[PDB]
Structures are given as C-alpha cells and as structure tokens.
Symmetry: D2
Subunit: 396 residues, 4 copies
C-alpha cells in the first residue's frame, strides 16, 4: 500500500519505515557507517551518475536518515526531506542554498535568537541583505519586498510572547512578488500545524524540540519540493555547511517521533490547564498562550493550528526581582533554555539569558523584566500547577 | 599532573579524558543530551556571561565532545579544538568564520574534491574569491597572494597522486604576506604530521578517516588558537553552519582514537610492504607512495612526516579497461570511496567516481585512466598482496 | 523533595532521575563503561566493604541502570529494583536466588511459554520441583502447596486467552502457607496494575514489552524488598545468571518509559475500540479482552486493573485455514511474536509458533486453531479496524 | 571465498562480517530491535521449525550478535559461538547447560573470584558438586575425577600469580575419563592462545577484557561444537540464564575486536618491558610474568602461548602498608579492578578487594600482603615505568 493514505497517527508510527528487507528486523537498523561498498566498478559508477538508487557515503545519504527524511516529508505533506546536524543547520543550509551575494531576505523580527544573529550579522557579510519586519502585519512584509528578495522567512508561534503569523496570507504575498516562503515550524510540529498545506514552500524544524521530544538529540530537518531538497542536499549540505545528521541521532529521532501524536496531545492538554490557572492568578499580570481567547490573534490560531501548543509565557508581578525569586523557588520545573522535552522546563530571560543587556535592548527581543517562559512537560498538570503556585506565592 | 607532558602514546590514550568526577566511570560518559539544567537563575546568567565554566546546550558545547576537542588539541600541539558534523563542516566552519565578501583565498589545486567544489562554486557566490595554484611550487602561492588574501589553504599529502606541500616554507610565505595558513591534516593524522609545529595556524581533519579509524563516524575537528576557536564555535558553528557533532559520534571518535598510534604503525608498515610489491610488479607502470625513494618529494616527506602513510595510488598497465577488470577481480579489498578504515578499501576513479567525465577533465583532478587508489587496512599484508596479485594478473 | 510524593505521570517522567551533578546534563548520561576508578586504596576498600556508596564494576551496578531500577521501584511501590538482560533473566535470577534443591514452586499453567519451559524442564534438573495449577481457581493453588513450597508464581492477565488471577486472594493464600508470591506484571505495566500493592512480594517484568515500548530492547526488571533485591543482585545476578543489563539498554528503557502513561492510555483506548469491533463481527466467534463485559472475570479485572490492556485475542470462523488466510491478508498489522510495541503486531499461533504440534497439544497452551493474538499499537484505530475487516472478509 | 582461509589479522578484521546485503553499508548495522517481522504465516512457521534460516526475536538470535559469534568461532577455530550478557553468564550458561543434579565438576582452584563463588556456593545448592584442585598438577585433576564428573574447568594463565595449566595434557586426562574440558581463555584472547587447538571442548571468555579491549562493554562469549552451542542457545540462554547480549554491546565488541591483534602486540611488548624493569628493581621482591624466564612454567608458556600477555603481578617490599602507599602514589596508572583496557590499571588486593579478610584467608586466593596486580595498557612504556618507579620509591 501507500502510507500517504493512512491516518496521521498511523503515519507517525509507520511512514518512511518498514521491516529490514534482509532480516525482517522491525526497528530501523542503525546504519552507523561512513563507508558503503559497491559490488562492482559499474555499480559504483551507476550510483555516482544517479543512474541507480543506493548509497555511497553517509554525508551524502544513509538508510537510517533516509527513513527519518521520508517520514517527516509525509507528515508535512512535502515531497522530500533532508536531515541536518541542528535546527540552525536546517535553517542555514536552506538559506545558503537559496541565496547568494546581492540577494535579499524579508524576515520576521520575532524569531529564534540564533537565527536572528545569523541573519543580522553573518548574512550581510556574504552580501545577502535582510530586512526585519513585524510579520504579524503582512503589509510590512509586502512593503519590505525588493526586486532582489528571494525569501520571506517566518516563525509561528513566535517566542517569547507566542504571537502568530498568518501563513496563508504571507505565502500569497511572497508568491505574488516572486519569493519563496520558508516557515520554521519547530514550535508546533507537523501534528499541530502544516505550513506547506497553507502555501509555504519550505518547512524547517529543530528536531531538538518536539519532533524528537526526549531532550537528547540536537538535529534539524528541511522539507520541501524534490528539486529544492536535491540542491539543499548535494550543494548546501555536501559543500557549504557539511551539517549532516549522525545515523544514531536519526534513529533516536525516529524513535522519539513514534510518540509525537500522544505527546503533543498531552503537552497541549497540560498547557491549557496551566495557562488557565495562570490567567486566574492575581499575582500574574499577563499570560501568553494561543489557547486563551484573550490572545490577540486567537481566531487565526484556531484556523491555522489544530492545538494551541505546549509553550506558555507569562509575566509575574514585581518585575525582575520577582521573576528571579520565582524561578529560584520551583522544585519540579527545571531551569533550562530548551523546550519540547518530556520534563517541564522554565526560564526567566531577564535574569538568565539577557541579564547583561539594557532593559530597552531586552524588549528588542520582546523580553520584559517579569517575563517567564514555560515549556510544559508530561507530568501531572496538578503537580506542575502546585509547583508554580508555591513558587509564585513565595516570589510575590 | 599535566597530560601535555607525557609521551605521545600516553596522550593518545589519556589526553582530554579522566574518570567521571561523580561516579569514577572510566569511559567518558556519553552525555547524549540537548538540555542542561541550572541550579539557579544566577548560575544560568553566569554561564551566559562567560563568568562561570559549565554547559548550557549541546550545540554550544558538551562534556563528551569537549573531551575529544581537548584530546585533539593536545595531539596537534594546539590551544583548543572544535568538533564538527563532518570534515567538510570543519573546513567550511573555519573558512566562513575567517572570510567575508571581498576576501580572497589562495588554495592548492590538489585538494579533496568536495572542498574544491566549495571553493570553486560556493565561495565566489558569497563574494569570496579563490585562486588555485600548484602548492608543490611555493612560488605559485606567493605569486597568487593579493592584499585581500586572508587564508592560504593546503592538503599534504594530496590525493590521488600523494604529492606533498612544504608546510614550513608555505607558512613563512603566508605569514610574510599577512595571511593565515590552514592545513587539512586528514591523510596523516597528528601521529604522523603536526602542521602547527611547522608554522600552520589552523589544522582541520575529517575524523571520518584515520582519527576515528573504524568506518562508522562522519565528523570533523578544527584545532588552533583559543581566540580563533572561540570565534569558530560561537559564530561559525553556532550561527553559520550549525555543524555540531553528536555526543555519541564524539564518544565513538574518542574510542577510535585510543588506538590511533598502533593503527597508524600497522597501516604504514602494511602500506610500505604493498607499495614495494607494486613497484616490483611488471604490470604496474607507476606507484605513488611517500615511502618509496623514487617519490619526487621523498626527502621533504622524510623531514615532515614521521611515517609515509597508509594510502597508495598506482597505475595499472592497460588503462581504463584494465583498471576496471582489476577492481572487479579483487576478493578481499572492498570497493569504496572512503579511506582510513580498518578494512583495505580500493577504488578506480576513472570507472567509478569520474566515469561520465572527459579524459582531459579527469586529469584536472590528476586522474589517469589506469589510476587505482588503495587505502591499506589492518589485514595481514600477505593477504592483501595475494589479492592484488590475483586481480592484477587477471586484469592484464 | 521526594519523588515518591508526586502524581504517577510525574513519577514516570522524573522518578530515579535528576540532572547530572557534575555538568547539569538533563538526560541521564549513558555510563557505557565496565571499569570504575577509585581515588585511593581506602576508597576501593570502603566500597567493597559496603561502607561507602559508589560504583565498582558494571556487572555489580552502574549509574544509568541504577536510575532505571529506582524509577521502576517507585512505579511499582517497591523498595528496590534490579535490571536484567531479559525478562527471562528477571524471572530466573529471582527463582534461582530463592530456591535450591528440594524446594518446590506452585505455578500457574497459563504462563509465558519460555517460563513454562524453564519451570517444566530446567528447574527439576536442579532438584527444584514445580506443580502447575489453574491459577484462576485459588483453591488449586492452596491444594498444591507443600511444606517445601517457597514460591507461588503467577501472570495476570495470562496470554493467549487473557484470563486473570486474583492477586490479593492468592497472596493471602501463599502467605498463610509461608510462601512468597511472585507476579509477572509484563502485560499490564505498573501504570495499569500494581501487584505489590495487592500483597505480592516480588514483581518481575520483561521491559521488552510495554515498559520500554519501542521494540528495540530486550531486558527485564525485578522489584521487591531491599533485602531480597540485594540477594538477587549480589548472588543471583553476580554469580548465577550473570544477566546484567547493558547501560545503553537501560538508557533506552529510561527513555521509552518516559511515555509509558500516554502510551498505555492510547494502547488501551485503541484496544477497546478494536475489541468492540471484533465482538460485533459475525465472522469472529470469540473475543478475549478484559474490557468486554462478557469476559468471565470482568469484575475482578475492574478492581485489579486500572485499564483493560493493549492485548486482544480472538477466534476467527473457519479454524486453522481461515486464521492463516487472515494473517496473510493484513496490510498494516505486522506478523511478529512480541508485544507492547508502538506498531500493531499480530500472530496466529496454530500456523506460526505451534504448527508442528498436535491439536490436543496446542490446547495445552490454550491455543485453538482459529485463535489470533493482537498487540494493539498507536496507529489510528480506524486504520487498524479497516485492516482487520479487510483481512477477515478475505479469509472467510 | 572462505574467511577461514585467510591470515589471523585478516580474520580479526573480516571474519563473520561483510557489507550489508540490502545497502552495502560496511559497518555491521546495529540491529537494535527486539521484534522481527515475517512476510507470511508460512515463513514464521518455517523459522520456528528450523526449516528456514532467519531471525525471530533478539533473545534467540540477532544479525549483529551473529556476526560477533561467527567471528569469535573463526578466531578460536571452533564451530559456533554464543554471545552473552557477561563473562559470568558465558561460564554459567555453559555449566548449567551441561550439568544437572548429581553431576560433578573438577575445577582449578586458581580461578576468577566470582566463578569460584558460583562453583563453591551456588552449584552445590543445585545438587552439582565441585572438587577444587591445583590444576598446575595434572595428577590432582585425575585423582579428583569421579564417575559423575561431566566437566573439568580451568583458567590459564590464572590470576593473581599468573600460574599456568597445561591445556593439552589436561584435555587428554579429561577425555580419557569421559569428561569435557572447558577453558576460560579471557586472559590471553584467541590472538595469544587457542585452547580448542590443544584439545579443549569449549572456550569461554569475558569479552569485557581484551576482546572488546575498550573498557566499555560487559559481555561474554562461548565457543564450541555446533551441537553443544545449539543447546547452550536454545536451553541454557533461552530458558535458564536469559543472559543474552544487547545488539549494541555486540556491535561495540565487533568494533573493539578489529584492533585485537595490534592491541595484544602492544600490550605484551609494553608488559615485557615493565616486567623486566620490575625484576631489576631492588624494592620489588617478586615479579610474576610468563615472559620472564624465571617463571616456574616458563617453557610450557612458550609452547602454549604465542605472547606472554599484558598482565603482571609483583610483590613490593614492606607488605601491606607499602602496597597501600605505592598504589596511592601512582599518577598515571588508574586504580581499578578490571583488566584488558587501553589504560593501565592497577590494584592492591590486600588493601582493596580483600581488606576485611584474614591474611590466611587471603592466601586462599593466592594474595600476599604486598601483591600488586597490573594490567598494562597502550601508553608509552617509559611513562608507565616512570610512574611505577616514582610510586615504588615513595612507598619504600
Ligand atoms: C531550538 C530552536 C531552533 C534551533 O535549533 P537547534 O537544534 O538548537 O540548532 C530554531 N528554531 C526554533 C523555533 C527553536 O526553538
Ligand atoms: C574525507 C575527507 C574530507 C571530508 O570529510 P568528511 O568527513 O567526509 O566531510 C576532507 N579532506 C580530506 C583529505 C578527506 O579525505
Ligand atoms: C516477552 C515476555 C517474557 C520474556 O521476556 P524476555 O524479555 O523476552 O526475556 C516474560 N513474560 C511475559 C508475560 C512476556 O510477554
Ligand atoms: C572479568 C573475568 C571474568 C568475568 O567476566 P564478566 O564479564 O565480568 O562477567 C571471568 N573470567 C576472567 C578470567 C575474568 O578476568
């Protein structure tokens, strides 16, 4: 049969995978090899000429990684996938394949910090200019487009305030002006949002977050048309970034993604409960969560996202010192800077990642002094709420 | 004590490593994690401000990978190391950290094919121009230097004819003209050649070859001054290539490198025997091996290399068809395109990697129709010789 | 705090685990080591004398495996855990620690086939006699008890007809007669049944099934009182079976168990839907599933099990040939002999595992000619039902 | 061709292994699976009936582990191999397959401590009696034989004094009296001693030591006739010990064994240098090493062993307190209780493993107060000697 025909949970479990043909092994074997052996000179030449399918060398391609690439292509409804060493490598392999000196990119300003650093500081040194705009306002995207614009780049939801971008509307604007739309879908995973179905051309993820979900893999994935992915593989990865994924990391990500549907359901069920608790707490001034009807783009989120996500941000009364006291008072939530793990993770940017920055520079990343970012895990939500209540009460 | 004080075999085993402090575990633990947890807001801020040692997130740094980086820095007599997703990523993370639009690179022409593709086709699209020269002639390096030249880039020995480059002489030329010298030391490993001791500024390796040695890791390493490595880590890797190494791959490379000294001794003992056998064979027109006194740069090799290496190239009588017949007639040597594995690997480029290319285009990579490339493994050399003799006899 | 105080999902995620003390790594490091190093002669002696905590050698104990042992002890409400190379090793390490020549065991007859082979053929050759009884009838257990009986051994539910054993009632009988009760809890996992809370003394699992859940680990676990577990570790494992678990297998099982709660919820939701579909199908003569009210011990199952499980057996009309045709006609369910994986697995014992046996010998394992065993996975239940309907329709 | 025809180093690299048939991957894939899938009911039945080759379930057999089993069978010149969870499991799976209540074993007294504990305390509780003899005196073996003796069990060399057993002579005695000879060949590895070639029936190893060689695997192997190995697999392992090896551990051992020849050569070259240094040191009363001509069985060792090994024991002047001071004064040698790793390991049993024992009880394991045991690693021997000289000088 064809796995593209089954339901989404069935695809999560099975797409891109099948029992090993020589042994019947059910788990995808870990092809932890660099070298592949040819049966003859002619078989080697046939593979190098693309006249025969098969493998050559793990930087170019590998059976374990191929399974992950095919699975994620199915889940995003794209033609082809390309696994990478990190989410950053997925982003930069994509953009360095597409762009050359003299080209231009229109990017959302509300993007992952290291992506912003790449676009702000590294791209212009290669002659590739970037204009940053508020992508919640599609007119600002249009106004920033130039004859040289090759790419519009967006993230949605966008940390740390969980604002949204209207993918379908932005895709139409980008395409009318001759540009590709690249969407970083890390926050949602394909279980909750499908940018290619809304007109995006390329989707990138850090699999480090929800796709792997177990806090033990750094990796990325790119999904798009075969013609583009082939260039991203044989030029961007092979020559430019060298950012190939280890077969063992691909195997762990295949293993983690098996539970993506059930994990996202529980992350989001837990997060909605915690978000409602925080919205009712008189020591919490604001709660940013797409599942609360007061979210400024709530209706867009309901049309574009099948679930409101596992991430919450909120502001605690009392600013910087209260946020520091609160984060130093949790006993179950763990202080860390990643997200999408099975454990609940918490961070206070103004006292952690952005401490030696001026308050007006911190807002440039949307960071207020009392802002706390919470990645909701798979624990009992009552335990998470009790921990938050205990810490908030102490802090205020 | 200080491991930088012990003998080289002792350093191979011990440098960069020690029993785990919390448990005493002798093997370096596999810190297969993405996330690291802070004990307090203040500890997180201290790490982000570089005011406290410790870890944050595996793309930035990891204890397992740190051990590999420190070991390879000791072995190359460099200050610091940076592990990468691939040898290509080591090369491009280095050059994309050092160079920006308007800069220039002087490169040897006799370099790894994918490095050549990066330099020929990708660098100029970022405004970084490259002049290729015959680096066996240091005067051609000097003549190609421009005010904008930031880097001279060399490999030695250089596949597929095993020609050499005089590292010390080229380093002096590069430095007099204000450029850094980057040496790809993959072929030799630090056990056989130490470019930093001869004046190079930066050494890169594909650990995929001899350093790991077991044919099961794609990876790279960069070694140089702390100031440069810090930029390669926090800009080149973090932002540009995203080419971080998986902790499991670092652990496998640590494990492989434990036997680097004994492996290189056996590879080179075997290769010298096989090279002498081939040089005495009337069906073999030429043998390229630094350990044969007829090698055109033999004396330079004796001063610069402690052993002549594990790689041999040779030309079989009868050109393309004889090379194809020979490679299709081996029974022990394995047909493949990597090198530095414990198994003997063999390839015939004119019928394998470069078949759909014109004979005059193949020479542009030094490839004649009868040229065979042999990576000598750890088998009994008598068995390798018998296999080669059987195949040569059949082919001719 | 104490993790034994949190909710069960919180314990699944966190019990037995914490950030690495020397680095903060969130994932439990893979301590893939044999050797541990002492700081002094005195520290080595202190560990060998049990006068100091810490590690010596991985066969005796290991930090990664210790985390798994502690987690499973928390989840089963037992004092201590011991990980093993396989479920069989958990069973035999337990029984060979407890029993010596002249001792006796009363065992259920409806037990895992290889356990039955150990008890029937291997135990008596060591002078340890075994009486098999129908453990659904607690009076048969009582009647089989002898002065030499050390252990009553049961599984519940019991494959392949999913009959039950009343743990609390059997525990009272065993204890009144001076014997320990050992329960194999593999089928249910601690998420669905807690034998120690009902009076059992020792729980064993094959973690190969639901606890790991990902079809990529063979392993076992024993949970019980510290005094017994210490004997199982330092005599049974150290000396008798040698069945220690690899640190990597323990790490994978820790990783798999993170999703145990959400997996069991989905397995059982899916299984109840499929069981009801099969019970309404006129080509299916019988359906064995604890969640159907027609199950002969339905009310006991509701008191003893929090969910009815992920396993279903059923009889297809037409006996042996229909069962063979049906199993050869599924397109999504995979033909295999394990259970508890994320993929739906199916087997027809009369044509697969028990084909060269007489029909009257097959019933001795409860196997009728039309009996099919289904391990329900995490796919969309509609897809599983459609596959079963297609295959049943073709077969009948 | 047939790998049993190549030289021993070629076999170390290649025996039991070949490129993956479906992909050409050179490294043996890690078949980290529990479940295997059948294409039809008939294929499942054919495998269960042994009428078709192939896999069923990893406890029974696995492609990665099969490669290791076949390689070690080739290296020991035996018919078949069986991998296990530990060296202890190799020993007990063997003996519990061969023996039942009423049987008898004649064992050397100079054996590994946990093997001695199994034979002394556990075997008799299963009705299997054991007589311990000085196996350096073959007449004591003969005199201890009884009508019920099934097995003669020996280790050679034997820790901690490195005494020897004449394998060929003992095999002839055992066979004349109708018993099998089992030899634990862990100390030597097949590179240095081949008991089956000298008449032994079964060889066991802890692969934890030299075969893996990297201090990161606990595991065992059994090698013998196909008829016996089949019983050890399908009864001893399947039913009794459950001591199967994890596929990942088998893959690591395959990887470690690739360098067995070059490692043993260097271990033994280093050990002979260190042994000669110790024999010339006036603070060292005795040196136990088969490569010193003063060894009491030196000539037997030269006939039976191709190299004298990597292990040395020696007595330091001043007894218990000097041994403790010496071991607390090394800076490079690591204090630990395993052997065969790439790092040099050292232990002082009288102050470490046997401290709370009476001096007359310590001699029962051949342990004098000043006895030090050294596992010589791959470091520069000059560095090891300097470390030992520094520590000896301080201690005396
Ligand atoms: C973490 C993250 C990234 C970067 O991925 P890495 O795997 O850390 O390189 C990119 N985008 C988003 C939205 C992320 O959360
Ligand atoms: C193989 C090789 C490389 C590339 O390294 P990868 O690990 O394949 O990316 C670079 N230089 C040399 C000399 C090589 O042999
Ligand atoms: C599979 C199973 C076992 C055996 O465990 P292994 O890990 O295969 O050794 C024991 N009991 C039950 C109920 C099982 O399903
Ligand atoms: C270490 C050893 C063993 C035991 O093997 P494990 O892998 O630790 O179970 C048995 N025999 C000898 C000679 C050993 O050195």
């Amino acid at each position: 049969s064809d796995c593209r025909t089954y339901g989404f949970n069935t695809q999560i479990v099975h797409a891109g995978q099948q029992p090993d043909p020589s042994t019947g092994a059910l788990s995808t074997p870990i092809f932890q090899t660099s070298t592949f052996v040819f049966d003859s000179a002619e078989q080697g030449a046939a593979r190098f000429a693309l006249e025969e399918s098969g493998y050559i060398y793990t930087r170019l391609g590998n059976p374990t990684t191929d399974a992950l690439e095919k699975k994620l292509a199915v889940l995003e409804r794209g033609e082809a996938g390309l696994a990478t060493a990190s989410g950053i490598s997925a982003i930069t392999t994509t953009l360095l394949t597409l762009c050359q000196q003299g080209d231009h990119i229109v990017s959302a300003s509300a993007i992952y910090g290291c992506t912003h650093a790449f676009l702000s500081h590294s791209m212009p040194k290669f002659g590739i200019n970037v204009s940053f705009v508020d992508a919640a306002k599609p007119e600002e995207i249009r106004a920033a487009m130039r004859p040289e614009t090759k790419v519009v780049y967006i993230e949605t939801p966008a940390n740390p305030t969980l604002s949204l971008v209207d993918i379908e509307t932005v895709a139409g604007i980008a395409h009318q002006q001759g540009a590709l739309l690249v969407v970083d879908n890390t926050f949602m995973s394909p279980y909750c949002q499908q940018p290619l179905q809304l007109g995006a051309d390329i989707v990138v993820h850090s699999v480090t977050k929800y796709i792997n979900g177990h806090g033990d893999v750094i990796g990325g994935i790119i999904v798009g048309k075969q013609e583009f992915i082939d260039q991203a593989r044989f030029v961007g990865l092979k020559d430019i970034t060298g950012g190939c994924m280890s077969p063992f990391n691909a195997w762990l990500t295949l293993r983690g993604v098996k539970t993506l549907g059930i994990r996202m359901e529980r992350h989001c069920e837990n997060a909605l409960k915690i978000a409602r608790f925080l919205e009712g707490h008189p020591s919490i001034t604001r709660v940013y969560y797409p599942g609360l009807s007061s979210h400024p783009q709530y209706e867009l989120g309901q049309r574009q996202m099948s679930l409101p996500g596992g991430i919450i941000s909120f502001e605690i009364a009392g600013g910087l010192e209260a946020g520091r006291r609160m984060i130093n008072s949790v006993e179950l939530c763990l202080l860390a800077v990643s997200l999408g793990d099975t454990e609940t993770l918490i961070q206070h940017p103004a006292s952690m990642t952005h401490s030696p920055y001026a308050p007006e520079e911190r807002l440039k990343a949307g960071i207020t002094d009392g802002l706390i970012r919470l990645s909701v895990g798979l624990e009992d939500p009552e335990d998470i709420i009790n921990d938050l209540e205990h810490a908030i009460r102490k802090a205020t």
